[PDB]
Amino acid sequence: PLMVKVLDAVRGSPAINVAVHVFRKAADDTWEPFASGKTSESGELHGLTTEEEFVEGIYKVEIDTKSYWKALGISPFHEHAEVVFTANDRYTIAALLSPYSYSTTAVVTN
Amino acid sequence: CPLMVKVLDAVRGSPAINVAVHVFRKAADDTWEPFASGKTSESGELHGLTTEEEFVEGIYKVEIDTKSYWKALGISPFHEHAEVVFTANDSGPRRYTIAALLSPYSYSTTAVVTN
Numbered sequence A: 001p002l003m004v005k006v007l008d009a010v011r012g013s014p015a016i017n018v019a020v021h022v023f024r025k026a027a028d029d030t031w032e033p034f035a036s037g038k039t040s041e042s043g044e045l046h047g048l049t050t051e052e053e054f055v056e057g058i059y060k061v062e063i064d065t066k067s068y069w070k071a072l073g074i075s076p077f078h079e080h081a082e083v084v085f086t087a088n089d090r091y092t093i094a095a096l097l098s099p100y101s102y103s104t105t106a107v108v109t110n
Numbered sequence B: 001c002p003l004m005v006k007v008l009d010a011v012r013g014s015p016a017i018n019v020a021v022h023v024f025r026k027a028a029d030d031t032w033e034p035f036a037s038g039k040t041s042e043s044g045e046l047h048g049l050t051t052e053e054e055f056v057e058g059i060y061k062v063e064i065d066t067k068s069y070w071k072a073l074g075i076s077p078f079h080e081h082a083e084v085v086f087t088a089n090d091s092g093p094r095r096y097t098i099a100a101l102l103s104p105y106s107y108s109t110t111a112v113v114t115n
């Protein structure tokens, strides 16, 4: 149901070994841990959740961009990139990273 | 200014007008505290959020209310908002422009930092 893809605009490559955490918004208005992982050699993170687990609600995908850049020896601007969205009854969250800029797009298919 | 936000609409090729922007600063206890807020003008720009005296070192979050923007135009968008989180002023005072480019299912953000 949910997958995350990360690309590096400086090196022209997948962004490998990027930490990603996914949160669901609780009735509290606080963010509850939901799923996490490390992007693969292809820049992708599969297996985050299942159909039965991934209910309607408000989700946050936090991509640890600052750690990624530091591991490359490159100086970054952002602490992270947070992507917040409502799931309404397959989602791909894609991000393209530069040191002082990022973009994110959702690809939503049937 | 030391902090400016600019927002553009990639569907219409125009400034994104009347977009609410909320800025928070991380407190000593690790919570987000309100810092400043405003809305973009007819040029898509938001000036006058803060001052050199008020804009101290810290970790700041700029939350741009993209969902309300698209809903007012009669469009159902994907994201709740666009958030930009950064450490400011660590090596001394800087001027920050945070720009955002909006589409219904996509956004990009860029920072221009000057001394």
Ligand SMILES: Nc1cc2ccccc2cn1
Pocket: A094, A095, A096, A103, A104, A105
């Ligand atoms: N977010 C995002 C931005 C892109 C920009 C250029 C090409 C592919 C892309 C895929 N995903």
Ligand SMILES: [Ca+2]
Pocket: A034, A035, A048
């Ligand atoms: Ca699990």
Ligand SMILES: [Ca+2]
Pocket: B057, B089, B090, B091, B092
């Ligand atoms: Ca310092």
